[PDB]
Coordinates of C-alpha atoms and ligand atoms in Angstrom, one line a residue:
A6 CA 220.7 86.8 104.4
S7 CA 219.3 84.5 103.6
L8 CA 219.6 83.2 106.9
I9 CA 215.6 85.0 107.3
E10 CA 214.8 82.0 104.4
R11 CA 215.1 79.4 107.5
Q12 CA 211.7 78.3 109.0
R13 CA 212.8 78.5 112.7
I14 CA 214.5 81.8 112.2
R15 CA 211.6 82.5 110.7
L16 CA 209.8 80.9 114.4
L17 CA 212.2 83.0 116.6
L18 CA 211.8 86.3 115.1
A19 CA 208.2 85.5 115.6
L20 CA 208.5 85.3 119.6
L21 CA 210.0 88.6 119.2
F22 CA 207.4 90.4 117.1
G23 CA 204.9 88.8 119.2
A24 CA 206.0 89.9 122.8
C25 CA 206.2 93.4 120.9
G26 CA 202.8 93.5 120.9
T27 CA 202.5 93.7 124.5
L28 CA 203.9 97.3 124.7
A29 CA 201.4 97.9 122.4
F30 CA 199.2 97.7 125.9
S31 CA 198.9 99.7 129.1
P32 CA 201.5 100.6 131.0
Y33 CA 203.3 100.3 128.4
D34 CA 201.4 102.5 125.7
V35 CA 203.7 102.7 122.5
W36 CA 201.3 102.2 120.9
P37 CA 203.2 102.4 117.3
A38 CA 204.8 99.5 119.0
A39 CA 201.0 97.3 117.6
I40 CA 201.9 98.6 114.0
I41 CA 205.5 97.3 114.6
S42 CA 204.1 93.6 116.3
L43 CA 201.8 93.1 113.2
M44 CA 204.1 93.7 110.9
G45 CA 206.3 90.6 111.5
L46 CA 203.1 88.7 111.8
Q47 CA 202.5 89.4 108.2
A48 CA 206.0 89.5 106.4
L49 CA 207.5 86.2 108.3
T50 CA 204.5 84.4 107.2
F51 CA 205.0 85.7 103.5
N52 CA 205.7 82.6 100.9
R53 CA 205.5 80.0 103.6
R54 CA 204.1 76.6 103.1
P55 CA 201.0 77.4 104.3
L56 CA 202.0 74.4 108.2
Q57 CA 204.9 77.0 108.0
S58 CA 202.9 80.0 108.6
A59 CA 200.3 78.4 110.7
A60 CA 203.5 77.8 113.0
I61 CA 204.7 81.0 112.9
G62 CA 201.3 82.0 113.3
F63 CA 201.8 80.0 116.4
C64 CA 205.3 81.6 117.3
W65 CA 203.9 84.7 117.2
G66 CA 200.7 84.5 119.3
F67 CA 203.2 82.7 121.9
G68 CA 205.5 86.1 122.7
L69 CA 202.2 88.1 122.9
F70 CA 200.4 85.6 124.8
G71 CA 203.3 85.4 126.9
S72 CA 204.8 87.8 127.6
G73 CA 201.0 90.0 127.6
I74 CA 198.8 86.9 129.9
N75 CA 201.4 86.0 131.6
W76 CA 200.4 87.8 134.8
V77 CA 197.0 85.1 135.1
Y78 CA 200.2 83.2 136.8
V79 CA 199.1 85.0 141.0
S80 CA 195.8 84.3 140.6
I81 CA 196.6 80.4 139.4
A82 CA 198.9 80.5 141.5
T83 CA 197.0 82.1 144.7
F84 CA 193.9 80.8 143.5
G85 CA 194.2 77.1 143.3
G86 CA 197.3 76.1 145.1
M87 CA 199.5 74.2 143.1
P88 CA 203.4 74.2 143.3
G89 CA 205.0 76.8 141.3
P90 CA 206.8 74.4 138.3
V91 CA 202.8 74.1 138.0
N92 CA 201.4 77.4 138.3
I93 CA 203.9 78.2 135.0
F94 CA 203.3 75.3 133.5
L95 CA 199.2 76.3 133.5
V96 CA 200.5 79.5 132.2
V97 CA 202.3 78.3 129.3
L98 CA 199.6 76.0 128.2
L99 CA 197.4 78.9 128.1
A100 CA 200.0 81.2 125.9
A101 CA 199.4 78.5 123.7
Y102 CA 196.2 77.9 123.8
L103 CA 195.3 80.7 122.7
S104 CA 197.9 81.2 120.2
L105 CA 195.8 78.3 118.6
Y106 CA 193.9 81.0 116.8
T107 CA 196.5 83.3 115.3
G108 CA 198.2 79.8 114.4
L109 CA 195.1 79.1 112.6
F110 CA 194.2 82.8 110.6
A111 CA 199.0 82.6 109.3
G112 CA 197.9 79.3 108.1
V113 CA 194.5 79.8 105.9
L114 CA 195.7 82.8 105.3
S115 CA 198.7 81.5 103.8
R116 CA 196.3 78.2 101.8
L117 CA 193.8 80.8 100.7
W118 CA 196.2 83.6 99.7
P119 CA 199.8 82.3 99.2
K120 CA 201.0 85.0 96.8
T121 CA 202.6 88.2 98.7
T122 CA 199.8 90.2 97.6
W123 CA 197.8 93.5 98.8
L124 CA 194.7 91.1 98.1
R125 CA 195.7 89.0 101.1
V126 CA 197.9 91.9 103.2
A127 CA 195.0 94.1 103.0
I128 CA 191.8 92.4 102.0
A129 CA 191.7 89.2 103.6
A130 CA 193.8 89.5 106.1
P131 CA 191.9 91.7 108.5
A132 CA 188.5 90.1 107.3
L133 CA 190.0 86.8 108.5
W134 CA 191.7 88.7 111.3
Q135 CA 188.3 89.7 112.0
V136 CA 187.0 86.0 112.4
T137 CA 189.9 84.4 114.3
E138 CA 189.7 86.9 116.9
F139 CA 185.9 86.5 117.5
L140 CA 187.0 82.2 117.7
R141 CA 189.4 83.4 120.6
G142 CA 187.1 85.3 122.0
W143 CA 184.0 82.9 122.2
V144 CA 185.3 79.7 122.2
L145 CA 184.9 77.9 125.5
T146 CA 183.2 81.1 127.1
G147 CA 186.8 83.0 125.5
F148 CA 189.6 85.6 126.4
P149 CA 189.3 88.1 123.8
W150 CA 192.3 89.9 125.6
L151 CA 194.7 91.5 124.0
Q152 CA 193.2 93.5 121.1
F153 CA 195.2 96.2 119.1
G154 CA 192.4 98.2 119.1
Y155 CA 192.3 98.8 121.9
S156 CA 196.2 100.2 122.2
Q157 CA 194.3 102.9 120.3
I158 CA 192.3 103.9 123.6
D159 CA 194.7 107.2 123.4
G160 CA 196.2 107.0 119.5
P161 CA 194.8 108.5 116.3
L162 CA 193.0 105.4 115.1
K163 CA 190.2 107.1 118.4
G164 CA 187.5 108.3 116.3
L165 CA 186.6 105.4 114.6
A166 CA 185.9 103.2 118.2
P167 CA 181.8 105.8 119.0
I168 CA 181.9 104.7 114.8
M169 CA 182.2 100.8 114.1
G170 CA 184.0 99.7 117.7
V171 CA 187.1 98.6 119.3
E172 CA 187.5 95.6 116.5
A173 CA 186.9 98.1 113.6
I174 CA 190.4 99.4 114.6
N175 CA 191.3 96.1 115.3
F176 CA 190.4 95.6 111.8
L177 CA 192.6 98.4 110.1
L178 CA 195.3 98.1 112.1
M179 CA 196.2 94.6 110.4
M180 CA 195.1 96.3 107.1
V181 CA 197.5 99.2 107.5
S182 CA 200.0 96.8 109.2
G183 CA 200.3 94.6 106.2
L184 CA 200.7 96.9 103.8
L185 CA 203.6 98.7 105.6
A186 CA 205.4 95.0 105.4
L187 CA 204.1 94.0 101.8
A188 CA 205.6 97.7 100.9
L189 CA 208.6 96.6 102.8
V190 CA 209.2 93.4 101.5
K191 CA 208.1 94.0 97.9
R192 CA 210.3 97.2 98.0
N193 CA 207.4 99.5 96.7
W194 CA 206.4 102.8 97.6
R195 CA 202.1 102.8 97.0
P196 CA 201.5 99.9 99.6
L197 CA 203.3 102.3 101.4
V198 CA 201.4 105.1 100.8
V199 CA 198.1 103.6 100.9
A200 CA 198.9 102.3 104.3
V201 CA 199.3 106.1 105.5
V202 CA 196.6 107.3 103.9
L203 CA 194.4 105.0 106.0
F204 CA 195.7 105.2 108.6
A205 CA 195.0 109.0 108.3
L206 CA 191.8 108.8 107.2
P207 CA 189.8 108.6 110.4
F208 CA 191.9 111.4 112.2
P209 CA 189.1 114.0 111.3
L210 CA 186.8 111.4 112.9
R211 CA 188.2 112.7 117.1
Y212 CA 186.5 116.0 115.7
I213 CA 182.7 114.5 116.5
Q214 CA 181.6 114.9 119.6
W215 CA 179.2 112.4 119.5
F216 CA 177.4 113.2 123.6
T217 CA 175.6 116.0 124.9
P218 CA 176.3 116.8 128.9
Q219 CA 174.0 117.3 130.6
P220 CA 175.0 119.3 133.7
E221 CA 172.1 120.1 135.5
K222 CA 172.7 115.3 136.3
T223 CA 175.9 116.8 138.0
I224 CA 176.4 114.2 141.2
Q225 CA 179.2 113.6 143.2
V226 CA 180.3 110.5 143.2
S227 CA 182.6 108.4 145.8
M228 CA 183.9 105.1 145.1
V229 CA 185.0 103.3 148.2
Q230 CA 188.7 101.3 147.5
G231 CA 188.6 99.1 150.9
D232 CA 192.1 97.3 150.5
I233 CA 190.8 94.5 151.5
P234 CA 194.2 91.5 151.3
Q235 CA 192.9 88.8 149.0
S236 CA 194.6 86.4 151.5
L237 CA 191.3 87.6 153.9
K238 CA 189.4 88.8 151.5
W239 CA 186.7 86.0 152.2
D240 CA 188.4 84.6 155.9
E241 CA 185.0 83.9 157.8
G242 CA 186.3 86.1 160.7
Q243 CA 186.6 89.5 159.5
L244 CA 184.0 90.5 157.8
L245 CA 183.5 92.7 160.7
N246 CA 186.1 94.5 159.9
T247 CA 185.9 94.7 156.1
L248 CA 182.0 96.1 156.9
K249 CA 183.3 98.3 159.6
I250 CA 186.1 99.6 156.9
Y251 CA 183.2 100.7 154.3
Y252 CA 180.7 101.9 156.6
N253 CA 183.3 104.5 158.4
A254 CA 184.8 104.9 154.8
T255 CA 181.4 106.1 154.0
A256 CA 179.2 107.4 156.3
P257 CA 180.9 111.2 156.3
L258 CA 180.2 111.3 152.2
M259 CA 176.4 111.0 153.2
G260 CA 174.8 114.2 152.0
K261 CA 177.2 115.4 149.8
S262 CA 178.1 111.8 147.6
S263 CA 175.2 112.1 145.7
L264 CA 176.2 108.2 144.9
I265 CA 178.9 106.3 147.1
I266 CA 180.3 102.7 145.1
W267 CA 181.6 100.2 146.9
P268 CA 183.8 97.5 144.5
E269 CA 182.6 93.6 144.2
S270 CA 182.3 91.6 146.8
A271 CA 182.8 93.9 148.9
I272 CA 180.5 92.9 151.8
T273 CA 181.8 89.5 151.6
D274 CA 178.9 87.5 153.0
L275 CA 175.9 86.1 151.7
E276 CA 173.0 88.9 150.7
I277 CA 170.5 87.2 152.9
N278 CA 172.7 86.8 156.3
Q279 CA 173.3 90.8 156.0
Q280 CA 169.7 91.6 156.2
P281 CA 170.3 94.2 159.3
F282 CA 173.7 95.6 158.2
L283 CA 171.8 96.3 155.5
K284 CA 168.4 97.3 156.4
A285 CA 170.3 100.0 158.6
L286 CA 172.7 101.0 156.7
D287 CA 169.4 102.2 153.1
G288 CA 167.7 103.8 156.2
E289 CA 170.7 105.9 157.5
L290 CA 171.3 106.8 153.3
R291 CA 167.5 107.3 153.1
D292 CA 167.9 110.0 155.6
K293 CA 170.4 111.8 154.2
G294 CA 169.9 112.2 150.0
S295 CA 172.7 109.4 149.2
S296 CA 172.4 106.0 147.8
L297 CA 175.1 103.2 148.1
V298 CA 176.2 100.7 145.3
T299 CA 178.0 98.1 146.5
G300 CA 178.8 94.5 145.3
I301 CA 178.1 91.3 147.0
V302 CA 177.0 87.8 146.9
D303 CA 173.7 86.5 147.1
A304 CA 172.9 83.3 147.6
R305 CA 168.9 83.1 146.8
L306 CA 167.2 80.2 147.3
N307 CA 165.3 79.0 143.5
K308 CA 161.4 77.6 143.4
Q309 CA 162.8 74.0 143.2
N310 CA 164.9 74.2 147.2
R311 CA 168.4 74.9 145.9
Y312 CA 171.0 76.9 145.8
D313 CA 171.8 80.1 143.2
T314 CA 174.7 81.8 144.0
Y315 CA 175.1 85.3 142.1
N316 CA 178.1 87.8 142.2
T317 CA 176.2 90.4 142.2
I318 CA 175.6 94.7 142.9
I319 CA 172.7 96.0 145.1
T320 CA 171.5 99.3 145.5
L321 CA 170.4 101.2 148.8
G322 CA 169.8 104.9 149.9
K323 CA 167.9 107.5 148.2
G324 CA 166.0 107.2 145.5
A325 CA 166.7 102.7 146.1
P326 CA 165.0 101.6 149.0
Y327 CA 167.1 98.7 149.7
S328 CA 164.9 95.4 149.2
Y329 CA 165.7 91.2 149.4
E330 CA 163.2 91.4 147.0
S331 CA 164.1 94.7 144.7
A332 CA 164.7 93.9 140.8
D333 CA 167.3 96.8 141.9
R334 CA 170.1 94.6 141.5
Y335 CA 172.7 93.1 138.8
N336 CA 173.9 89.5 138.0
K337 CA 177.7 88.8 137.0
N338 CA 176.2 87.2 133.6
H339 CA 179.7 86.3 131.9
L340 CA 181.2 83.4 135.0
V341 CA 185.4 83.6 134.9
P342 CA 186.5 80.5 133.3
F343 CA 188.3 78.6 136.6
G344 CA 187.6 81.3 138.9
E345 CA 183.6 81.2 139.0
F346 CA 182.8 77.2 137.5
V347 CA 184.5 74.7 135.9
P348 CA 184.2 74.9 132.2
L349 CA 182.7 71.8 130.4
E350 CA 179.9 70.3 133.0
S351 CA 180.8 67.1 131.6
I352 CA 183.0 65.9 134.3
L353 CA 181.8 64.2 137.4
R354 CA 183.8 62.4 140.4
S365 CA 180.7 75.1 143.5
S366 CA 180.1 77.5 140.1
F367 CA 178.3 80.5 140.1
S368 CA 175.3 81.0 138.2
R369 CA 175.2 83.8 135.5
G370 CA 172.2 85.8 135.5
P371 CA 171.1 87.1 132.3
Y372 CA 172.9 88.5 129.4
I373 CA 170.0 91.4 129.2
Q374 CA 169.3 93.5 132.0
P375 CA 168.7 96.5 132.8
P376 CA 170.5 99.9 134.2
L377 CA 170.3 99.8 138.0
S378 CA 169.3 103.2 139.3
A379 CA 170.7 105.0 142.2
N380 CA 169.3 108.6 143.2
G381 CA 167.9 109.6 139.9
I382 CA 170.8 108.0 138.4
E383 CA 171.1 105.0 135.4
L384 CA 173.8 102.8 135.3
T385 CA 174.8 100.2 133.6
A386 CA 176.7 97.9 135.1
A387 CA 179.5 95.1 134.3
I388 CA 181.4 92.8 136.8
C389 CA 185.3 92.1 136.5
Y390 CA 186.0 91.3 133.0
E391 CA 182.6 91.9 131.4
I392 CA 183.7 95.6 130.8
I393 CA 185.6 94.2 127.9
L394 CA 183.5 92.8 125.9
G395 CA 182.3 95.4 123.9
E396 CA 179.1 94.0 122.6
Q397 CA 177.6 92.6 125.6
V398 CA 178.2 96.2 127.2
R399 CA 176.6 97.2 123.6
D400 CA 173.8 95.3 124.6
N401 CA 172.8 96.6 127.8
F402 CA 173.4 100.4 126.9
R403 CA 169.6 101.6 127.3
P404 CA 169.8 106.0 125.8
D405 CA 168.3 106.7 129.3
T406 CA 171.7 105.0 130.6
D407 CA 174.3 107.9 133.0
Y408 CA 176.7 106.3 133.4
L409 CA 179.3 102.9 132.5
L410 CA 179.4 101.2 135.9
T411 CA 181.7 98.4 135.8
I412 CA 183.8 97.4 140.0
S413 CA 186.3 94.4 140.1
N414 CA 188.6 93.3 142.4
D415 CA 191.9 93.4 140.9
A416 CA 194.1 91.8 143.7
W417 CA 194.4 88.1 142.0
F418 CA 196.8 90.1 139.1
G419 CA 199.2 91.3 141.7
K420 CA 201.1 94.3 140.9
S421 CA 201.8 93.0 137.7
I422 CA 200.5 94.4 133.7
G423 CA 197.0 92.9 134.3
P424 CA 195.1 95.1 135.9
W425 CA 196.8 98.0 133.9
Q426 CA 195.5 96.0 130.3
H427 CA 191.8 95.1 132.7
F428 CA 191.5 99.4 132.9
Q429 CA 192.7 100.2 129.5
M430 CA 190.1 98.0 128.1
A431 CA 187.1 99.6 130.2
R432 CA 188.5 103.0 129.2
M433 CA 187.3 102.1 125.6
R434 CA 183.6 100.8 126.5
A435 CA 183.2 105.3 127.1
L436 CA 184.3 106.1 124.1
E437 CA 182.6 104.6 122.9
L438 CA 179.4 104.2 123.7
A439 CA 179.9 108.1 125.0
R440 CA 179.3 108.0 128.7
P441 CA 181.0 108.6 131.5
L442 CA 182.7 105.1 133.4
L443 CA 183.0 104.5 137.0
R444 CA 185.0 101.7 137.8
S445 CA 185.1 100.9 141.3
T446 CA 188.0 98.4 143.0
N447 CA 189.4 96.8 145.4
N448 CA 192.4 97.9 145.5
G449 CA 193.3 98.3 141.7
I450 CA 193.1 101.6 139.3
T451 CA 189.7 103.3 140.8
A452 CA 189.4 105.8 138.7
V453 CA 186.5 107.5 136.4
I454 CA 186.3 107.5 132.4
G455 CA 184.7 111.1 130.3
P456 CA 182.7 110.0 127.3
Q457 CA 185.5 110.4 125.2
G458 CA 187.7 107.7 127.0
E459 CA 190.0 110.3 128.8
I460 CA 190.8 110.4 132.9
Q461 CA 188.6 112.3 134.3
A462 CA 189.8 110.9 138.2
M463 CA 192.1 108.5 139.4
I464 CA 193.2 107.4 142.9
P465 CA 196.6 105.4 143.4
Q466 CA 196.5 101.2 142.9
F467 CA 197.7 98.9 146.8
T468 CA 195.7 101.8 149.4
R469 CA 192.7 101.9 150.9
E470 CA 191.0 105.4 150.2
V471 CA 187.7 106.8 147.9
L472 CA 188.1 109.1 145.4
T473 CA 185.6 111.7 145.1
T474 CA 184.8 113.8 142.2
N475 CA 181.1 115.4 140.6
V476 CA 181.4 113.9 137.2
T477 CA 178.1 115.0 134.2
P478 CA 176.2 112.6 132.5
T479 CA 176.1 113.0 128.9
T480 CA 173.3 111.8 126.3
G481 CA 173.3 110.4 123.1
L482 CA 173.7 107.6 120.7
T483 CA 177.6 106.9 118.8
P484 CA 176.7 105.0 115.2
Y485 CA 178.2 102.1 117.2
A486 CA 175.6 102.1 119.9
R487 CA 173.0 103.0 117.6
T488 CA 174.2 98.9 116.0
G489 CA 177.0 96.9 117.9
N490 CA 179.1 95.1 115.5
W491 CA 177.0 94.0 112.7
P492 CA 178.7 97.4 110.5
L493 CA 181.8 96.5 111.0
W494 CA 180.9 92.2 110.3
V495 CA 179.4 93.1 106.7
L496 CA 183.2 95.2 105.6
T497 CA 184.6 92.1 107.1
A498 CA 182.1 89.9 105.2
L499 CA 182.5 91.9 101.8
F500 CA 185.9 91.5 102.1
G501 CA 185.7 88.0 103.2
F502 CA 183.5 87.5 100.0
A503 CA 185.9 89.1 97.8
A504 CA 188.8 87.9 98.1
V505 CA 188.4 84.6 98.0
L506 CA 187.2 84.9 95.4
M507 CA 189.8 85.5 93.5
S508 CA 192.1 83.0 95.2
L509 CA 189.7 80.3 94.6
Ligands
LIG1 C1 191.2 74.6 126.9 C2 192.5 75.4 127.4 C3 193.1 76.4 128.7 C4 194.5 76.5 129.1 C5 194.4 76.7 130.6 C6 194.3 77.5 131.5 C7 194.2 77.2 132.9 C8 194.3 79.1 133.3 C9 193.0 79.9 132.6 C10 192.6 80.7 134.2 C11 192.7 80.9 135.9 C12 192.3 80.4 136.7 C13 191.8 82.7 137.4 C14 191.2 83.0 138.6 C15 191.1 84.3 138.5 C16 190.0 84.3 139.8 C17 188.4 84.8 139.3 C18 187.6 84.9 140.6 O1 187.5 84.2 140.7 O2 186.8 85.8 140.7 C19 185.6 85.4 141.4 C20 186.0 85.6 142.7 O3 186.0 83.8 142.5 C21 184.5 85.3 143.1 O4 184.1 86.7 144.2
LIG2 C1 212.8 93.4 115.5 C2 211.9 93.1 116.9 C3 211.3 94.6 117.8 C4 210.5 93.4 119.0 C5 211.4 93.9 119.8 C6 211.4 93.0 121.5 C7 210.3 93.3 122.5 C8 210.3 92.6 123.3 C9 209.2 92.9 124.5 C10 209.2 93.4 125.3 C11 208.5 93.7 127.1 C12 207.3 92.6 126.8 C13 206.4 92.5 128.1 C14 206.8 91.6 129.0 C15 207.1 91.9 130.5 C16 206.1 90.3 131.1 O1 205.9 90.2 130.8 O2 205.8 91.7 132.4
LIG3 C1 216.9 91.6 111.4 C2 215.6 91.6 111.6 C3 214.7 92.3 111.6 C4 213.5 91.7 110.1 C5 212.3 90.9 110.6 C6 211.3 90.4 108.9 C7 211.5 89.3 108.2 C8 210.7 89.2 106.8 C9 211.0 88.4 105.7 C10 209.9 88.3 104.5 C11 209.6 86.9 104.1 C12 209.7 87.1 102.9 C13 210.3 86.4 101.9 C14 210.1 86.3 100.0 C15 208.5 87.1 99.7 C16 208.4 87.1 98.7 O1 208.9 88.2 97.9 O2 207.3 87.1 98.4
LIG4 C1 188.4 77.4 128.6 C2 189.4 78.0 129.0 C3 190.3 79.0 128.5 C4 189.8 80.7 128.2 C5 191.1 81.2 128.4 C6 191.0 81.8 130.2 C7 191.0 83.2 130.6 C8 191.6 83.8 132.2 C9 191.1 84.5 132.9 C10 192.0 85.5 133.5 C11 191.7 85.5 135.2 C12 190.8 86.9 135.4 C13 190.3 87.0 136.6 C14 188.9 87.8 136.5 O1 189.2 89.3 136.2 O2 188.4 87.9 138.0
LIG5 C1 188.0 99.8 107.9 C2 189.1 99.9 105.9 C3 188.8 100.8 105.8 C4 187.5 99.7 104.8 C5 187.4 100.8 103.1 C6 186.8 100.1 102.1 C7 188.1 99.8 100.7 C8 189.2 99.5 100.8 C9 190.6 98.8 101.1 C10 191.7 98.5 101.0 C11 192.4 98.7 99.3 C12 193.6 98.5 99.3 C13 195.1 98.4 98.2 C14 196.5 98.4 98.2 C15 197.2 99.3 97.2 C16 198.6 99.0 96.4 O1 198.5 97.6 96.9 O2 198.5 99.2 95.7
LIG6 C1 198.0 122.8 110.5 C2 196.8 123.7 111.8 C3 196.2 123.1 111.8 C4 196.0 123.2 113.9 C5 194.1 122.2 114.1 C6 193.1 122.7 113.7 C7 191.5 121.9 113.7 C8 191.5 121.0 114.1 C9 190.7 120.7 115.0 C10 190.4 120.3 116.3 C11 188.6 119.4 116.7 C12 188.8 118.4 118.4 C13 187.8 118.3 118.2 C14 187.6 117.6 120.1 C15 186.3 117.3 119.9 C16 184.9 117.7 121.2 O1 185.3 118.6 120.7 O2 184.5 117.5 121.5
LIG7 C1 181.3 76.1 125.4 C2 181.2 75.6 127.4 C3 181.5 76.2 128.8 C4 182.7 75.7 128.7 C5 184.2 76.8 128.9
LIG8 CL1 186.5 88.8 145.6

């Protein structure tokens, strides 16, 4: 009845529609839940004072992030060793912090566009959503987790991503959901019909093959899922076991896999301390026709006699002869706040160093791979900026053990697939215990191995070539459209 007119009621409803969005993502993968959840955000903010709407937008995001990233509890409650009730409160406060952007969005849109209009709902709303999600992903090194475009990796809007990137899918979903909500509140069919047409219009885009496979460059790839337990992962007494596990999994594959991939910091020891093992492995790999790509930590003495410690990938074997001075390596550029550095260096009473934002592809046995470590693979623009036309495969390596048996590693994995569709290359993804797989150049799963197991994924994979429209332009076409919408929307209501 008029129960829905009560602000506190709209806030409770905001939690449910918000938390409903978590179902859009992996493993749930009910992509219609994203439109449900966005319709709630669009409708529940109608006809509210701007500060009430900002609260509703806040409470909507608290349902999303509260239900969707509460897996960070495992990382927190294990990495930083605090009481438990306290690690719960940290997860709340992170879910609260992210919900500020979703409260910012609702407040500004209520303030600038108070009327229940298609202008507010289809023009202002997605342009403002483009900006607020941008800030959520940039401020304090950002956290653009749970963006609804990723739930379309297997959906009808798929074919938009090679054109304009996953954020164009975000933009269209907010638009389509706004007119659906507008139609229901104002019981009018015109925004319903528009919402359908716009939702259907990208459907033929998934028929466009932007890439050309290179069957002559097809190689066999192995990725060793070592399954080194996080409680023992960096124990300074079982490096030998880790070294024996990965080596013994790799030796029988030499001469048969052109490319072998060990996950993030597989070698759990400084690169400078492992020269005899690395020099020895390199010659063996080269003696066979094989090449190895592995993560490792490099504490590198700088010019100033201090140490820069990097999260790195190194290359050995055929076509990439190992050398501590080699240029065939990649240093992680985007570091995990708290996990890899203390955010805000203004304090005083350690922290990884960063590699450059743009780095050349690694080269192993004649194959060029564009690398990302851990959740770097979710930074669509950073990946596209490192991508080169001569790239053969996308490569990401990750240790998802920090998130345990939750929906975390599935969300991470879904986002990495979006990169394969966007730049239309295969994605090689290599992890410690979770979600090691090969993604085809259209985001399909070509191969995966089960989580929490010690084994190697071995399969043939064909490099592709050609440039998608998004690989040629990055994010700037969508920004121009959001500036046009923003300029246009603001011009009327101002
Ligand atoms: C500004 C307000 C924010 C609100 C408060 C938020 C607090 C929780 C945030 C992050 C938890 C840390 C996650 C740590 C996950 C571990 C990742 C990691 O450490 O991986 C690299 C490894 O350590 C090297 O090999
Ligand atoms: C009328 C509102 C419709 C929405 C119905 C409620 C859906 C709630 C979301 C359920 C699952 C969300 C994920 C929580 C599980 C987790 O934290 O791992
Ligand atoms: C069982 C609850 C499910 C439905 C929840 C959605 C309620 C949305 C309320 C829309 C607000 C509209 C109030 C007046 C707006 C207008 O006509 O301008
Ligand atoms: C500044 C802090 C605010 C930004 C949000 C914090 C990000 C939490 C990181 C989630 C844990 C993932 C760990 C990993 O993938 O290595
Ligand atoms: C990326 C999305 C497509 C963008 C195309 C540019 C112009 C489309 C704007 C949407 C029109 C919405 C009008 C609704 C009509 C109504 O309310 O009856
Ligand atoms: C009413 C019946 C029509 C049935 C559908 C016929 C036309 C659909 C076109 C399908 C093309 C799929 C393209 C896949 C992408 C690729 O080629 O890599
Ligand atoms: C904007 C400075 C980075 C601290 C998280
Ligand atoms: Cl690790």
